Amino acid sequence: GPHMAIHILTEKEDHATLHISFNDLIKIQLRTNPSTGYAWNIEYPTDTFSLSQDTIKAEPHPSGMVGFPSIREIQLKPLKVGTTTIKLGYSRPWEKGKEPLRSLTYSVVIR
Ligand SMILES: [Cl-]
C-alpha cells in the first residue's frame, strides 16, 4: 500500500463504489458552466467527510472559446471510517419546481 491515495471521480463514474483508506482523499472533478447560472450542489455526510478544498477554475481550451467550460473540483477527506453516499446535482439555485439537469451518485467505503 501507499502512504495515501487520491481518488478522482468524474461524471463518468456515476453510480461507482469506491473503497478508500482512512488517510486517502477524494477529488470530484466535474465540468460546469457558471455563465448559465447552474452549479453543482453536493450532499455528503458531514460527520464522515471534511471539505478539504472546493475550487472552480476557468479551463483553457478547446478554443473554441478559451474560458469555457469551467472545472469544479471538490476535495473530501475522511473524518471517520464507515460507509457513505455522496450525491451531486447540477441545478440553478433560485429556480423553483425543477429537478437537477444531471445527478451523480457515488458510494464510498472508508476502510
Ligand atoms: Cl459548479
mmCIF file of C-alpha atoms and ligand atoms in Angstrom:
data_model
loop_
_atom_site.group_PDB
_atom_site.id
_atom_site.type_symbol
_atom_site.label_atom_id
_atom_site.label_comp_id
_atom_site.label_asym_id
_atom_site.label_seq_id
_atom_site.Cartn_x
_atom_site.Cartn_y
_atom_site.Cartn_z
ATOM 1 C CA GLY A 1 0.000 0.000 0.000
ATOM 2 C CA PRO A 2 0.938 3.679 -0.397
ATOM 3 C CA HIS A 3 1.235 6.469 2.155
ATOM 4 C CA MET A 4 -2.119 7.595 0.816
ATOM 5 C CA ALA A 5 -4.064 7.694 -2.454
ATOM 6 C CA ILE A 6 -6.093 10.407 -4.117
ATOM 7 C CA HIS A 7 -9.114 9.076 -5.986
ATOM 8 C CA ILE A 8 -10.502 11.116 -8.854
ATOM 9 C CA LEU A 9 -14.220 10.938 -9.626
ATOM 10 C CA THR A 10 -15.866 12.477 -12.681
ATOM 11 C CA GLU A 11 -19.268 12.434 -14.378
ATOM 12 C CA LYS A 12 -18.234 9.130 -15.919
ATOM 13 C CA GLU A 13 -18.099 7.384 -12.511
ATOM 14 C CA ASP A 14 -21.777 7.938 -11.735
ATOM 15 C CA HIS A 15 -23.014 5.064 -9.530
ATOM 16 C CA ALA A 16 -19.475 3.825 -8.820
ATOM 17 C CA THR A 17 -18.489 2.292 -5.498
ATOM 18 C CA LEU A 18 -15.084 3.377 -4.239
ATOM 19 C CA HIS A 19 -13.163 1.673 -1.458
ATOM 20 C CA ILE A 20 -10.635 4.047 0.090
ATOM 21 C CA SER A 21 -8.383 4.121 3.145
ATOM 22 C CA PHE A 22 -8.784 6.429 6.163
ATOM 23 C CA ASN A 23 -5.937 8.699 5.084
ATOM 24 C CA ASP A 24 -6.972 8.894 1.422
ATOM 25 C CA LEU A 25 -8.559 11.834 -0.428
ATOM 26 C CA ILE A 26 -11.456 12.041 -2.875
ATOM 27 C CA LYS A 27 -11.272 14.606 -5.670
ATOM 28 C CA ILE A 28 -14.504 15.099 -7.592
ATOM 29 C CA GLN A 29 -13.679 16.885 -10.842
ATOM 30 C CA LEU A 30 -16.652 17.991 -12.931
ATOM 31 C CA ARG A 31 -17.247 20.358 -15.812
ATOM 32 C CA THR A 32 -19.529 23.310 -15.223
ATOM 33 C CA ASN A 33 -20.763 26.461 -16.997
ATOM 34 C CA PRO A 34 -21.192 29.268 -14.464
ATOM 35 C CA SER A 35 -22.302 31.732 -17.154
ATOM 36 C CA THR A 36 -25.648 29.888 -17.203
ATOM 37 C CA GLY A 37 -26.393 30.164 -13.507
ATOM 38 C CA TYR A 38 -26.032 26.403 -12.984
ATOM 39 C CA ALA A 39 -23.752 24.928 -10.344
ATOM 40 C CA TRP A 40 -23.072 21.538 -8.811
ATOM 41 C CA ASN A 41 -24.502 21.083 -5.340
ATOM 42 C CA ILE A 42 -23.006 18.355 -3.170
ATOM 43 C CA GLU A 43 -24.643 16.334 -0.410
ATOM 44 C CA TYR A 44 -22.389 14.259 1.796
ATOM 45 C CA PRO A 45 -22.289 13.117 5.426
ATOM 46 C CA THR A 46 -20.560 15.937 7.318
ATOM 47 C CA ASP A 47 -19.839 13.646 10.242
ATOM 48 C CA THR A 48 -17.799 11.421 7.884
ATOM 49 C CA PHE A 49 -16.053 13.801 5.452
ATOM 50 C CA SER A 50 -14.362 17.169 5.743
ATOM 51 C CA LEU A 51 -14.309 19.587 2.784
ATOM 52 C CA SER A 52 -10.587 19.993 2.274
ATOM 53 C CA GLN A 53 -10.857 22.205 -0.798
ATOM 54 C CA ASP A 54 -13.517 23.475 -3.187
ATOM 55 C CA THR A 55 -12.488 25.207 -6.411
ATOM 56 C CA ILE A 56 -13.962 26.489 -9.632
ATOM 57 C CA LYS A 57 -11.437 27.224 -12.367
ATOM 58 C CA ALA A 58 -11.773 28.547 -15.888
ATOM 59 C CA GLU A 59 -10.482 25.971 -18.376
ATOM 60 C CA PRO A 60 -8.007 26.915 -21.176
ATOM 61 C CA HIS A 61 -9.440 25.012 -24.157
ATOM 62 C CA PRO A 62 -10.927 23.921 -26.579
ATOM 63 C CA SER A 63 -10.528 27.417 -28.038
ATOM 64 C CA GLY A 64 -13.040 27.237 -29.214
ATOM 65 C CA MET A 65 -13.829 29.957 -26.679
ATOM 66 C CA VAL A 66 -10.876 29.802 -24.268
ATOM 67 C CA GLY A 67 -12.550 30.177 -20.870
ATOM 68 C CA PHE A 68 -15.403 27.704 -21.246
ATOM 69 C CA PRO A 69 -16.229 25.343 -19.794
ATOM 70 C CA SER A 70 -15.056 25.605 -16.228
ATOM 71 C CA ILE A 71 -13.928 22.902 -13.847
ATOM 72 C CA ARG A 72 -15.418 22.301 -10.410
ATOM 73 C CA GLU A 73 -13.188 20.373 -8.066
ATOM 74 C CA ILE A 74 -14.339 19.272 -4.639
ATOM 75 C CA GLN A 75 -11.862 17.503 -2.386
ATOM 76 C CA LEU A 76 -13.090 15.443 0.565
ATOM 77 C CA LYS A 77 -11.023 13.984 3.364
ATOM 78 C CA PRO A 78 -12.391 11.229 5.590
ATOM 79 C CA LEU A 79 -13.075 12.232 9.194
ATOM 80 C CA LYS A 80 -14.198 8.748 10.214
ATOM 81 C CA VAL A 81 -14.211 5.217 8.861
ATOM 82 C CA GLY A 82 -17.564 3.958 7.602
ATOM 83 C CA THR A 83 -19.772 3.773 4.521
ATOM 84 C CA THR A 84 -21.157 6.844 2.760
ATOM 85 C CA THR A 85 -23.123 8.097 -0.193
ATOM 86 C CA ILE A 86 -22.172 11.316 -1.979
ATOM 87 C CA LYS A 87 -24.796 12.919 -4.232
ATOM 88 C CA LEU A 88 -24.312 15.813 -6.660
ATOM 89 C CA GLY A 89 -26.930 17.750 -8.593
ATOM 90 C CA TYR A 90 -26.344 20.284 -11.345
ATOM 91 C CA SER A 91 -29.017 22.930 -10.883
ATOM 92 C CA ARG A 92 -29.938 26.618 -10.628
ATOM 93 C CA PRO A 93 -30.020 27.882 -7.005
ATOM 94 C CA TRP A 94 -33.139 30.064 -7.056
ATOM 95 C CA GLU A 95 -35.027 28.023 -9.668
ATOM 96 C CA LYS A 96 -38.358 26.713 -8.364
ATOM 97 C CA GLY A 97 -40.174 23.491 -9.262
ATOM 98 C CA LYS A 98 -37.337 21.861 -11.200
ATOM 99 C CA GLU A 99 -35.125 18.800 -10.768
ATOM 100 C CA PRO A 100 -31.368 18.931 -11.441
ATOM 101 C CA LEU A 101 -30.367 18.667 -15.102
ATOM 102 C CA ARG A 102 -27.927 15.953 -14.142
ATOM 103 C CA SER A 103 -27.429 13.976 -10.948
ATOM 104 C CA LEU A 104 -24.423 11.966 -9.810
ATOM 105 C CA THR A 105 -24.237 9.379 -7.038
ATOM 106 C CA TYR A 106 -21.138 7.778 -5.554
ATOM 107 C CA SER A 107 -20.828 5.145 -2.823
ATOM 108 C CA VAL A 108 -17.658 5.446 -0.777
ATOM 109 C CA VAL A 109 -16.465 2.879 1.744
ATOM 110 C CA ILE A 110 -13.776 4.185 4.082
ATOM 111 C CA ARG A 111 -11.988 1.151 5.467
HETATM 112 CL CL CL B 1 -20.116 24.295 -10.257
#
